[PDB]
């Protein structure tokens with residue numbers, strides 16, 4: 232009786248879901264399809280006002296790229312069902328001979344930071360970050376391919392006066408309006424190249440740091456790796472950490488190569504008593520390649536991970552939208568549960584055959600009477 | 601029935617207590633005192649082999665100063681009952697016109713780091729950290745008064761060749777034998793002075809960073825404050841952060857003033873499933889001045905704080921040792937409890953009149969039948 236249910240749910244109405252197409256009710260189609268057939272989310276929750284979802288997007292995608300959706304929401308119990316819209320299938324690399332594994336590493340670190348903070352905070356949004364630059368050089372879109380263009384962090388071009396990339400550059404940026412900010416601190420870890428016409432011997436070792444003008448704290452990344460830009464020596468891409476920062480006046484200091492600074496930040500507002508987030512596995516139909524980065528990111532004590540036991544098998548829309556088991560997994564949002572724990576959600580508050588671990592809410596005992 | 605009990609306890613025998621005189625059974629006295637009267641700990645637990653306690657010491661004290669005890673222990677449920685042996689009563693300052701509030705800030709940050717990590721790790725110990733220095737200058741004991749001498753972090757003297765403190769200095773240190781290390785990264789935030797014979801205009805702005813040679817990550821502190829060493833402008837002391845670092849080859853880089861590097865580290869071994877530590881308020885009889893830094897440090901979800909409702913009132917030993925209510929609070933260690941939660945320990949696993957919050961173990965329901 233009252234076994235842990237493999238669902239995502241809520242203790243009350245104070246909940247919010249962040250998602251993608253599988254939770255996006257505003258999507259339109261002109262065909263002989265059943266109404267809202269792309270959804271894993273139940274159609275009854277479309278008018279709930281507790282969902283931030285966009286077809287073809289994710290939190291990581293909007294945080295880093297020009298394909299931007301203004302994800303925003305507030306809730307005590309935060310649920311995530313997105314992440315698939317930046318996967319190994321997309322195969323993004325900043326450079327022709329880059330590395331997707333680095334970008335999966337970035338995905339894991341971003342979500343880890345986001346999940347941990349959203350266990351301490353009610354509100355999430357994405358705000359624009361402006362910068363003051365004393366030079367004449369303007370932003371350069373270095374990290375991109377033919378599908379995606381990265382715009383966070385922003386990269387500042389070399390000044391016209393400098394012949395090489397052995398220069399020191401800096402810029403100021405203010406973080407205002409939020410209790411905490413998640414910003415990317417990134418670096419090209421390896422041998423970077425200036426212009427395609429430079430000799431084969433001259434390479435640059437990227438260095439970047441962020442500096443708090445008030446507290447004097449600085450966090451930085453120096454280049455250490457051997458990987459590069461050529462076919463003979465490949466691997467160089469953009470490794471990012473995701474820092475939780477207080478509001479204040481910050482300085483971005485680059486000691487070598489391009490100056491990089493945040494253009495976007497995850498705005499964290501309204502602190503709450505510790506309440507772990509719920510994360511639903513976000514993967515393709517196994518014809519496309521997925522990753523378990525969100526699972527790597529989803530750890531105790533800040534996060535509970537939920538997954539089905541089957542391949543993702545779309546019903547009528549396509550192979551990637553409308554899975555029966557994920558529909559049932561998400562169906563838990565239609566009602567309140569008494570206890571949300573590691574194993575799953577316990578519907579009732581009194582007794583169970585299973586002892587709840589890391590339980591939140593009004594949790595049942597597994598004792599006799 | 602089965603109300604939360606204001607005690608520290610354990611779910612099984614897999615527990616360890618870190619303490620001071622109030623838990624130190626090896627202490628000796630030649631007088632007409634009752635046996636073991638300085639203890640808050642029950643005498644029956646003296647031979648338990650689950651206590652690391654020393655009369656007149658604490659974790660912070662041993663971590664920073666020459667008054668060192670080799671605190672070591674392993675347990676799933678870690679309990680702390682120490683901290684009073686570095687308090688505002690001691691009034692420690694690195695410099696004559698320093699600031700004790702900075703050192704209380706340091707106390708809060710150290711314990712916060714320690715408590716959070718000891719919720720993820722079974723084993724705690726203090727290991728010596730060695731360094732490689734290419735110069736001739738040897739350690740200088742700059743931070744001290746007439747009671748305490750700081751030896752962590754170690755400070756390296758200025759070289760004989762340098763006329764001033766506007767130099768760049770660096771040293772290597774290896775961290776080996778532990779899964780994670782807690783080390784202090786400290787700085788004199790303000791206007792530092794070289795020799796007492798230097799003019800009134802020449803001051804130095806302390807800068808210190810630690811650098812991972814492999815990953816390229818660096819964490820640093822620059823001086824920003826206006827406080828100094830004189831009577832006219834006082835306040836300058838040593839502000840420390842407490843970093844959790846992986847094993848590896850590290851570089852300590854100082855851009856101005858003295859080079860500082862860790863001599864001691866909290867060695868973290870044997871990762872465990874998340875289990876919050878229990879912390880008992882460590883304060884003097886109200887005749888001496890105490891602090892609530894360990895309470896500031898003890899936060900959800902990694903820590904449960906326990907306090908009595910009375911002044912600390914010693915029975916026979918002195919005013920600072922052997923309190924009835926703390927004895928009863930610690931008496932919970934004599935037996936197992938079913939559930940350890942935020943409000944306290946629930947003895948029984950079945951029913952309660954109170955809903956446990958952040959419960960660990962086999963926790964009771966507050967429902968009817």
Ligand SMILES: *[C@@H]1O[C@H](CO)[C@@H](O)[C@H](O)[C@H]1NC(C)=O
Pocket residue numbers: 363364365402403444
């Ligand atoms: C950045 O801030 C500093 C203050 O520390 C100021 O001196 C400098 O002019 C600022 N830079 C720009 C480009 O405004």
Ligand SMILES: *[C@@H]1O[C@H](CO)[C@@H](O)[C@H](O)[C@H]1NC(C)=O
Pocket residue numbers: 436438453454486487811851853
């Ligand atoms: C980091 O890189 C910069 C630029 O190459 C260099 O000047 C600096 O010494 C490096 N930092 C360390 C700690 O080696």
Ligand SMILES: *[C@@H]1O[C@H](CO)[C@@H](O)[C@H](O)[C@H]1NC(C)=O
Pocket residue numbers: 523526527
């Ligand atoms: C993720 O997948 C890798 C192999 O691809 C595996 O080693 C790892 O344990 C997985 N982690 C999680 C949290 O699923």
Ligand SMILES: *[C@@H]1O[C@H](CO)[C@@H](O)[C@H](O)[C@H]1NC(C)=O
Pocket residue numbers: 516517518542543544545546549550
């Ligand atoms: C993908 O989805 C379809 C359902 O539309 C299912 O038949 C198939 O097993 C899934 N996996 C594949 C093709 O690998």
Ligand SMILES: *[C@@H]1O[C@H](CO)[C@@H](O)[C@H](O)[C@H]1NC(C)=O
Pocket residue numbers: 242243244565566567
């Ligand atoms: C969940 O509980 C709240 C009050 O605690 C109530 O307003 C709401 O109707 C419940 N949710 C559903 C989906 O019925």
Ligand SMILES: *[C@@H]1O[C@H](CO)[C@@H](O)[C@H](O)[C@H]1NC(C)=O
Pocket residue numbers: 599600948949950951
């Ligand atoms: C709960 O367990 C305790 C100890 O076994 C027992 O005294 C009590 O009768 C039990 N209460 C209920 C309602 O089962």
Ligand SMILES: *[C@@H]1O[C@H](CO)[C@@H](O)[C@H](O)[C@H]1NC(C)=O
Pocket residue numbers: 732733734771772813
């Ligand atoms: C510190 O390590 C570096 C390697 O990065 C080495 O060049 C240097 O000689 C070392 N310093 C000392 C004093 O051994």
Ligand SMILES: *[C@@H]1O[C@H](CO)[C@@H](O)[C@H](O)[C@H]1NC(C)=O
Pocket residue numbers: 442482484805807822823855856
């Ligand atoms: C930190 O202090 C050093 C030494 O005074 C200085 O050279 C450096 O520019 C400072 N860093 C920043 C970011 O201002």
Ligand SMILES: *[C@@H]1O[C@H](CO)[C@@H](O)[C@H](O)[C@H]1NC(C)=O
Pocket residue numbers: 892895896
């Ligand atoms: C500690 O004491 C200060 C005042 O001395 C108070 O403002 C603060 O709330 C206290 N915090 C805790 C956790 O006891």
Ligand SMILES: *[C@@H]1O[C@H](CO)[C@@H](O)[C@H](O)[C@H]1NC(C)=O
Pocket residue numbers: 885886887911912913914915918919
């Ligand atoms: C300190 O302890 C004694 C018990 O020995 C008690 O009488 C007193 O109330 C305590 N507090 C003081 C003196 O402020």
Ligand SMILES: *[C@@H]1O[C@H](CO)[C@@H](O)[C@H](O)[C@H]1NC(C)=O
Pocket residue numbers: 611612613934935936
């Ligand atoms: C606590 O439980 C363990 C086994 O779970 C048992 O060995 C031990 O005797 C109990 N503790 C006490 C103090 O009786």
Ligand SMILES: *[C@@H]1O[C@H](CO)[C@@H](O)[C@H](O)[C@H]1NC(C)=O
Pocket residue numbers: 579580581582968969
């Ligand atoms: C637990 O509560 C549920 C729902 O109210 C009820 O069906 C069941 O009888 C209760 N079980 C016990 C043992 O009280």
Ligand code: NA
Pocket residue numbers: 437438439485486487488489490491
């Ligand atoms: Na750079």
Ligand code: NA
Pocket residue numbers: 806807808854855856857858859860
């Ligand atoms: Na220094």
Ligand SMILES: [Zn+2]
Pocket residue numbers: 260264265268269547548549
């Ligand atoms: Zn469709």
Ligand SMILES: [Zn+2]
Pocket residue numbers: 629633634637638916917918
């Ligand atoms: Zn005595």
